[PDB]
Subunit: 196 residues, 4 copies
């Protein structure tokens, strides 16, 4: 067992680092199962040469909508749950993380099947905020996934290995994903199938 | 489908922007139905030439009150729910947003009908906080709606259109509202009517 | 109806203000009923000549305790609820506010009667944080109430009046309290009495 | 009864203090019972010569995991509850505090017995954030506990005494722990045993 973090709070990541450069999100999001739940996931990278303090991730679904009364809200925003209720949206971001949105009854993907996904006109905006530890300054980084950038039935390739007491990141694999056996039903349909 | 936000996090809003100027709230609030719920709504504008980081909206009802014991609290404040429990009060404010307060059993408007509204001596204070992305500094903008500035049975005119790959804002329409068919009952009365 | 706050966000408080000076808490806390609930209350003042942005109030009970297993924690701290769950701990602090802690089943005062109060060895630490609007800087102000500084059966004298379109504060009354008819039972005892 | 904190907000701790130096976490975490609950605890120290404003504690369990579907997440992070839901993670850090994680059904230690603990490949990362009151700057301090640094059946030795109106800290005892009678069952097993 080789420490991620030393008792003195130094991280055993990126040997020879010195902990302006910009934060990377994965080009694609993926949907697939984790412990029996359908989840939407995307990857967020760290800053090789600074800690980000009070780092937090949020995500908005951007989607035009009509209310039952006929009000048309172009580009309507709604907050997509990525750990808000348990503090898991507060990141310890010292190597890349896969951020997971569990597609449950409160999720806007609840009723979206694999066939249905491509027909949807929607966009996920991902927003990381924090304080660059050196800089002193609050920062925000953003990205976006439209429908065609969400891969149904895929997982992220892992980036992290241990070399000589220090965890290292294959940034070559950062955006890489692979196919895995995944149902094609919506989360709602899965839940209904499961409940008889 | 034309992106709101580019993979690199630049927003496709206000072509030729450069992302001190001051934030605008709509002159009026409106009350009307959205998906079968009575909602109080107001509009908050963006800053044409800076992002606001960690932007959040709150609202206080200011209303003198007497407790059942006879204590008189002049200008008593109470927090009006505008997305606190789901993180929807954390704004991605890159074009104007309609902020919605659903008038449910916990709302101070729960028992206020259309006829009753004008007889009420109350004020809504709206408070946007965040960090101007350039400036570096925390900012706060405020406004206020007294009873006569709340329009029962109205919606906001939409401001947003797509022109040549870029979303544009008709600021001429920012404060504009229009009439829509709306019950005159209080939310409480609506709920009671609905439950038989 | 004279506005607390103008559409442009200027506050109608302290005519001739210019919105380092220090924040005042009331010398005493009081306990008495509000709408059928026993509440512990204290007063927090505003800064005559700056807004405080992202202002928030918290309070800790400081009290030595022994666990059932016999562990002695000197000066053990626990968080006293002053609006955390509804966002009412986020203050719009432009004139003095009475901050209220409702003494319910989760409160550390739940079982404390009027006779019992003076026998208790406890201290309430009150902590206001925020950003002074000019200064630029985060600030914290603190105070403290020991047992003998908590007045059972009292309310705060009101400080606020309207003079010529502007709300004014009688700072002479800031610390002043008055006696009101109040049961001497603990909140727990009151609840039990009420439930038969 | 000698005040922890004076009415003017000065703390009666470290006589002759002047309220860069670095924050200390205890070398070890301990597990033992508090009021009938198994708790994981660690100690966090204060800064002798500055207040920390808006101080907050969080903790991540770092543990490689395989999902039921066979996805391997190396160094998977999950947030360990240390007061998030009651605001008790917001510290009034003016002398050392023992931070407590109650091992309940939602805890990742729920099923970990005393014999099982040493066989686990896990790490707890503890993260204190806040604003150094003078400095002006946001700070973060970190540390870490691997399995062998968690002492099952132990409590922290108390550090705090009153000398001449001022609370003083025996920093010699800061890391010191002592053995106490503690069941060897997992929290889950304890709960099951208790429920018949
Ligand atoms: Mg901040």
């Amino acid at each position: 067992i080789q420490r991620y973090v030393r008792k003195d709070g130094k991280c055993n990541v990126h040997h020879g680092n010195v902990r302006a450069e910009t934060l990377v999100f994965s080009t694609h999001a993926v949907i697939s199962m984790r412990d029996g739940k359908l989840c939407l996931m995307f990857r967020v990278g760290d800053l090789r040469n600074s800690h980000i303090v009070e780092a937090s991730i949020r995500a908005k679904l951007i989607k035009s909508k009509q209310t039952s009364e006929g009000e048309f809200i172009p580009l309507n925003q709604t907050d997509i749950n990525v750990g808000y209720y348990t503090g898991d949206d507060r990141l310890f971001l010292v190597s890349p993380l896969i951020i997971s949105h569990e597609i449950n009854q409160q999720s806007p993907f609840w009723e979206i099947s694999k066939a249905q996904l491509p027909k949807e006109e929607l966009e996920i905006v991902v927003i990381l905020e924090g304080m660059v530890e050196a800089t002193g300054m609050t920062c925000q980084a953003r990205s976006s996934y439209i429908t065609s950038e969400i891969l149904w039935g895929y997982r992220f390739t892992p980036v992290l290995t241990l070399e000589d007491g220090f965890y290292e990141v294959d940034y070559n694999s950062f955006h890489e994903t692979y196919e895995t056996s995944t149902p094609s039903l919506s989360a709602k349909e899965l839940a209904e199938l499961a409940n008889r």
